[PDB]
Every structure is written in C-alpha cells, then in structure tokens.
C-alpha cells in the first residue's frame, strides 16, 4: 500500500463530477491515490440550487502540509488537477506543483477545467490562474472552450485545435488532448504533440449521444489516467477511454448526472471501438 | 436513477476512515449514496499531523438544504451516520433525521462514533448530542467502550453488554449491534432487540487500526439494503471485514482498495449462538 496518484479536483455529495469520478474510477482500476477536495457542495452546478462551499487556502495548505509531514505523498507517480474555485488554491497548486517535481518525476495531468460551450462555469480569477497552471503539465486536457480561453483562439475546427494547441506547445506543454471539438453531429478528439518528429498527431472522431454531463469529461480523464498507469499507450488509452464513456453514455437514462456508479463493471472495458486517424 | 442512501461522516483525502470507507463500500455495492461529510482531513487521527478542518455548521446546512429543494433525497430508504467533529452537526443532523422520518419510512444506522479501547476519540459536547442522535435510529452500533459511555454501565461481558443495551431499548432504540466485547480472552459481537417477541437476540464469537469499524458498518448497511436477514448480514459483514485486515500488512490503514473484490463475499463463516 502506497499512495501512487494525487488528485486535487471538486467535490460533490451527490453525483459525479470531478473527484468524485476520480474516486469511482481510481478505486476500481485499485489505483491506490489521494484526493484532496477543492470543494464540498452538494450537487454539481447544473441544478437548480446549489449549496456548499469551497475550500479555504488554509485548509488547503494545512492538508498538503499533513500529507508530506506524514510522507503520504513520498511515493505519488501521478498528479491531476481538476476544478478550482479560486485562483489562490490554482497558485498553492503550482508551488506544491514544483517541489513534487523536484526531486522525482511525476507525471502531471493538468485537466483545466473552466468551462464549457461557449460558456464558463468558473471565476475570471480561475481562468487567469490556469493558464499559468498548465505550463507545468506533462498532458492537459482541455476541451475547445477551455482551449479557446487558454490561447485566445477561436477553436471550431480541427484545423483551429491545432493552431491553438500550437501556441501552448510553444510554451512548453508537450501533450495536448482537446477533449470535444463539434463537428456537424460528430466530436471530435484531437491528440497534439510538441514533438512531431517522433510522435503523430491523431484525431478520433465519435459520433454525439445527445447530452449535458461535466462529469463526462471528468470521466473521460480518470479512465485516460488509468490505462496510462497500467502502462497502455497513449493512443489506445484514450480510444478505450472515449469507448468506455461512450458505454456509459448509452447506458445512462437522465441527463442529470452520468450513471457511472452502476457502469463500474464495465470501466476497465479494453475494447477500443473508433478509429484514429493521423496527421 | 435515484439516491438511496444518504451517509453522513468523516472524511480523509488519504487512507479510509468514515465518508471514505462509505464510499468505496457502497460504490464496489454500486448502492446509489449521498455522502454529506462532516471533515476534510489530510489523513486519520492515527498520524502525528492531521491537517485539515472540520465541517462548518453553516455549510452543512446549506449542503442539506440544496440536497432537499433540488429533490435528490426524495427516495432515500437508508440513513447512516458516523463520526462528527462538534455537536452543533448532531443536533442539526437530529432535525433533519426528525423531518426525514416524519414523512417517510427511512431505516436509520447510527454507529455511535466516540471512542474505543475505554478513550474517547471525540469532544465531550459530542458524547452528549450523541446520547440523543442514537434515540432516532433503527439501529446502533456501538462497541463495548461507546455501550459503555452511552449507557453509564461497565460493559466487560454479555451479561453486563445486555444490561446496558436494556437501558437503550427504553428509550425506543430497536436493535442495538455491540462491534466486540471483551468476555475473558473471547471477542464476542452482541445483537440485542428491544422487541424480543418477535426477535431472538444473540451472539457470534469472533477472533481478535482506525477504519476497521466503519468498514464494518458499510458491509452491514450493503447486505441489508440488498434484502439479507440481519442475522446473515452481520456473519457476512464481520467474515468480510475480517479477511481484509487478515490481509492488510501492518497497521497504519486497513488494505480495502486490494479488497475490493471481496467486499461482496457471501461467506458466513462463524456461528450464530441465541441467548
Ligand atoms: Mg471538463
Ligand atoms: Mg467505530
């Protein structure tokens, strides 16, 4: 038993977003890890009420200070970001960032969550802060409007995607999975790399199950984490991952929340349904 | 797609106590849950350093509140609750229970989170808002120790166990589950009821942390919700629960995530001894 993955995203007591997918999915793939809440509310934001609030700084602090104190982060491999309610916690993050890399290496898989079409759902503050975030990231997965926000590009195309992802690359992020770009009735997934002499851009093209969860992209990134803890190439773990979302996704009634908690079964499926195409 | 339990405890963001163990048990159960938690600790009690904060009584109204008005407890069926960090949560917690109950049949665990080992674990003002939390539930399980302080009586035996229970069933409380109970070098887990017309108390000889309680608790609350007799549900819980520490190496969190698998074991391995 050690602790191999640090997660820092929201919490909800109530259905499935951020950590809460992160717990669901980690804890089924046995991935022994750490979840350190962002946030303590009731139901996601999409409701007509919300209640709860967000972690304070100093909580925060006193958290991660108790987890290194105690070496209970000694041995993480693995760190994801996820939602944030205030920029403060966004720039504790990338100090706490920083000495985890320091002394060893762990892969960092920045997920910015921000907003989505066309619209945020997250403080200008956040937005600002993130945008700092990212630069630390081994992978981000940003879907087109959290790409559109990071860069100040429009992205409504492929051909935008990877404009956009260009300018982060040039700041240094080499791995960049734009999560959703709507094309007609298709998504599209777009997969871009800083290093394009040694690895292929890929695109995957879906088609839409007419939706509405935050938490399928929250999903979409724990299951993506997984397979690439278990040591599956990047390629095919994104196609199981988008495969097993889209299960999930057939399998789900409502629109209110994903129905992932009687989808458990079937999150460690292997089977990779869609094509990749390369650039 | 409906809530069915609502489970109010602790959490930690490593290890599994509380919330936590709740929901890796319920989840593994794929059993529907709310999970109110009452801390944001760093790690359990067990460490020299426990960063992180209790619960605010305002925020957990305003966490009640939405999960009322937005209807995502309208079907609950099962009400748990464990550990809180101040009694300004109990008695908040008593009028939500109070409103739960008085419109619909909910069937209401309260494991009576204290102390263990005769220590308490908890503020003194928690012991007294606990004394009046338990009269609400359906079913109670303490250990020896928190039998012990609820009631005011040594609880060193079965005979004083059910003399100490008998104080609590007249106060309403139907069915009372004592975790472990020291009778010479035997451990033995009690279920008295406070109906014994209808019910027929007994005991299970068990073999000799910080979680292992509430792992217990889930386990229980998951075979019960699937339809298993009591009695069942209690030899399930206590065989499951006890092949994972038989399996967890060392002492610091009990080894639930490798025993995931196992967590919906049908095992019954002890016996059922009515008294
Ligand atoms: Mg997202
Ligand atoms: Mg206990």
């Not at 907003?115 to 700092?132: L, P, W």
Request: aromatic residues 8%.
């Amino acid at each position: 038993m050690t602790n191999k993955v640090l997660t820092i995203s929201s919490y909800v007591c109530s259905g499935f977003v951020g950590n809460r997918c992160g717990m669901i999915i980690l804890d089924s793939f046995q991935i022994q890890s750490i979840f350190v809440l962002t946030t303590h509310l009731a139901n996601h934001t999409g409701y007509p009420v919300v209640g709860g609030s967000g972690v304070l700084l100093n909580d925060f602090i006193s958290i991660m200070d108790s987890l290194e104190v105690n070496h209970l982060d000694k041995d993480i491999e693995f760190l994801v970001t996820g939602y944030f309610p205030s920029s403060d916690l966004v720039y504790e993050t990338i100090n706490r960032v920083k000495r985890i890399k320091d002394n060893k290496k762990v892969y960092f898989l920045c997920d910015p969550i921000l907003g989505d079409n066309g619209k945020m759902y997250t403080k200008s503050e956040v937005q600002d802060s993130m945008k700092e975030l990212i630069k630390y990231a081994d992978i981000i997965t940003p879907n087109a409007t959290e790409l559109s926000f990071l860069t100040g590009l429009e992205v409504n195309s492929v051909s935008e995607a990877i404009k956009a992802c260009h300018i982060l690359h040039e700041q240094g992020i080499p791995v960049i999975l734009v999560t959703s770009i709507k094309e007609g009735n298709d998504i599209i997934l777009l997969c871009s790399f800083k290093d394009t002499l040694n690895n292929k851009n890929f695109t995957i093209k879906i088609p839409r199950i007419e939706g509405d969860f935050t938490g399928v992209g929250d999903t979409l990134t724990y299951i993506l984490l997984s397979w690439i803890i278990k040591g599956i190439p990047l390629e095919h773990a994104v196609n199981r991952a988008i495969s097993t979302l889209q299960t999930i996704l057939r399998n789900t009634v409502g629109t209110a929340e994903i129905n992932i908690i009687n989808c458990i079964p079937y999150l460690k499926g292997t089977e990779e349904s869609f094509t990749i195409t390369y650039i």
